[PDB]
Amino acid sequence: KVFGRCELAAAMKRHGLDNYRGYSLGNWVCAAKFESNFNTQATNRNTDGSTDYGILQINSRWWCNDGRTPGSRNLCNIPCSALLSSDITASVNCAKKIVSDGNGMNAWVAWRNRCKGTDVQAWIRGCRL
Ligand SMILES: [Cl-]
Ligand SMILES: [Cl-]
Ligand code: NA
Ligand code: NA
Prior knowledge:
It is classed as hydrolase. Keywords: lysozyme, lysozyme activity, catalytic activity, hydrolase activity, hydrolase. The protein is mainly α and 129 residues long. The chain contains four helices and three strands. The protein starts with a helix and ends in a 14-residue tail after the last helix.
């Protein structure tokens, strides 16, 4: 599914991402925009052979099992394909684990390079939340 901006904001809010670990909702929307263009089906292969999956581009080296990332951990205990669902629950639940691991949202390179330090509230402006 390709979410609309406000539709994703609302879904993220309902799943408890607003100010999760101190990151306001706009940060999550911004991250999703630049990680996946709001597309739950986005995948991208990394040079190390891992793949990033879903709206938040969660990486199979650490977080999910895709059966082809040797030596990889599945810290979210999910098949990576679950992260492609039109239901963002699994992505959100896994993202909560990632953001809690000590590095915050810096785990998302697009967030660090395109969202961090910017007016991220713009990403939820206008939305009925
Ligand atoms: Cl915000
Ligand atoms: Cl933090
Ligand atoms: Na992979
Ligand atoms: Na994801």
